Structure formats: structure tokens, C-alpha cells
Design a protein around this nucleic acid. Sequence first.
DNA 1: ACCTGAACCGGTTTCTCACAGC
DNA 2: GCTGTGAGAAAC
RNA 3: UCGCCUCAGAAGAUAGGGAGAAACGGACGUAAGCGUCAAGACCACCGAGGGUCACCGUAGAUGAGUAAUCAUCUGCCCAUCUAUAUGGGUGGUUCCCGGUUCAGGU
Length: 257
Amino acid sequence: NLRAYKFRLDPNQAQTTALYQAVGAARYTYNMLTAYNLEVNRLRDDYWKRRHDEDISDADIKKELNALAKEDKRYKQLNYGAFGTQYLTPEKKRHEQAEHRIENGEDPSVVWNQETERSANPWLHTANQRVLVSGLQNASDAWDNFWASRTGKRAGRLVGTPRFKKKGVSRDSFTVPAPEKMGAYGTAYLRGEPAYKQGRRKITDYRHVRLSYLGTIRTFNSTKPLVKAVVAGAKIRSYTVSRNADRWYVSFLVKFS
DNA sequence: ACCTGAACCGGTTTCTCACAGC
DNA sequence: GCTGTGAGAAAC
RNA sequence: UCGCCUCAGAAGAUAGGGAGAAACGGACGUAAGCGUCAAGACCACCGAGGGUCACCGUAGAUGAGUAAUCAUCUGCCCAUCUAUAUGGGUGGUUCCCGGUUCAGGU
């Protein structure tokens, strides 16, 4: 019983900048996860081929791989959460230390250089957790989708290999969930935003939606159907922000009940 | 960038700062 | 000037 | 009088940069690229940034806002459904369900 109210956003420069930073962060996390999986499976297939010279069955190799799930973790694949905890906030702390050691005078070239990493300065620790973990969501979904397509589950043609996303070749989009604060008419603002400096506290019309740490953003549509659905026993679930060419869209997933 | 084309599905929970509304 | 409430990180 | 791109979430009324004479064809600067400009109203700062509409027939009330605009009820009109000429109830031109990934063609 799920609908989707797809509004066309009407953001401004200060909000489009955060949207671009968000899609960049999701893409960057997507790339790290897919790379980790890719050069884990390269070793996987090299080992499988190098042990294929001697005839082996499928149960024996499965038992061996299961027994190799405690040591030499190079034979393991990670979800969004496990990879996040194990390799993302370590790198967030690495970025933080790279600022905690350039505070007032230091050598940044020995700490951060644009040779092995295309970042001008560290920025991964000042990125919102929701946006960052969205890329983990997408990458884990793609890899599980393909390993389900292979074995026995997904009907249709064989499904490719996960391709590294690029700026202008792939899709830009991130999902931000509840129980964060979001919604149409009848919802409160954010403390500290330029619309809270003026003191305004609640949405009292039909051309605004609430988008978490991004503030409250306008729409091209009208939210009267959304609010009239809300006052029947129906509550929003998440919001997905997406880009098409130079246009931004937001989907509000409502669950009527 | 613009589509098919198809196949599948639609987020919770907790602990720690910083105004705030007098 | 004080303490619940909101906003955001962290795990997951 | 016509219509190729451009602003109004998509199609039918009103605005945008230049042309054509119901036919053809986006523009400017610099065989090519590249960059840039194209919707009106109110306050805010020294041509730059932020909110409001570009959906809601027709008359009132008082709600939020320095204000553009907006909200909720009460009169009238029209359209649309059910139960037995009457009671109610739904609107003010209609439509909308979107995310993820890969393989293709343009």
C-alpha cells in the first residue's frame, strides 16, 4: 500500500552545494566498497583457478572456505554496516588527524598529497552519516544482487559486473530515512538555519517539505494531497533525492494505513 | 543525456553537545 | 544562568 | 497568422532570444569545439544572494507574516456518488508510484 509523492525540488545555491557534496560522498563510499569487493574476488578466482588443476568437488571447497572464515580475512566480503564500521570511520579519523596535525603550521605534503588520493584536503569526517551510508547501501545492494543473479534466484539475463561510478556517466541519488524529522505542512523547522534566525517554527502552507539536516526545501508541486493523506492515518517513511541532467527531484514514500 | 528492458522492492536505535527562552 | 528538547554521530 | 529550442512537476489558456512567410529553421561571442543569455512581485546587503506565487468559482469572518502570499470555517452556484422526489459528501479542468542495478540502442 505504498505510494510515492515525487516533487520537483526548488533548492538554492546553499542547498544545491550540499546536494552535490552528498552525491559525491555517496559515490566515493560506493567506489571504496566496490573496489574492496573487486580485489577480494580477484584473489578468490585466482585461488579457485590455481586449485582447479587437481580435480575437486563443490562440497569440499565449500567446507574449506567455511573453515577459512576465521583467519586471513582476505577471503571475506562485507556488507554496508560491517565495511562502514571497519574501514570508513578509521578513514574519518585519518582525515580528522590530518586536520588535528595541520591546525597551526605543519607539513601537509607528508600528511596529505594529491598523488595517491584525488582529494585536495580531508573531508570525509565532516560528512553526514546518512549520506555516507547511502553509498554503502547501494554498493552492498548491487553486489548482493549480482551474487543472487548468478546462483539460482534472479530470472532473466546474466547481470554484468558492478561498474565504478563516475561524475557524469552514472546516476546521482541518495536516500535519507526516518525517524529523522521530515514532512510537509504540520512539521517543525531546524535550529540554527537561516529560517530559524527569523524565528519561524512550523510549516503553515503547502509548498515546503522538511529534509533533515538540509533544512526545509521548497517544491514546484503542491503538498495539499500529501497533507490530506497525512491526516488520515498515513505517515511518511523516507525521502530519496535524485538528479536528472541539472534537475533535482525528491520522492516522499508514504505508507497509507 | 535519453531512453528500453527487465527484475525486484519501499531503515531503526542510542548516546552526547548546544542553544533557548525565558 | 538552567535543564529538557532537538540535532547529529556511531553502530548496525 | 504560423512554430524550432527556453520558465511554469505532464498535457490544454499567459510570458521568454532570435527568426521566417501555412512551409522552412534555435541564438550570441569565439571543420570545429567551448563558454554565455533568454518567466513577473515584495523586503533584505555592497550587479550578488533569500523567501512567495506562475494550481485552487463566487461573497464574509478572524488565524501566521514588516509583505508578497497563505490557512481554517460560514453564506451561494455547478458537477459528481449512495439509501428510501428527499437526506447526506466529494471537489472547483484532468493525471501521476517511485527507487536500485546491470545489458543494450540512440
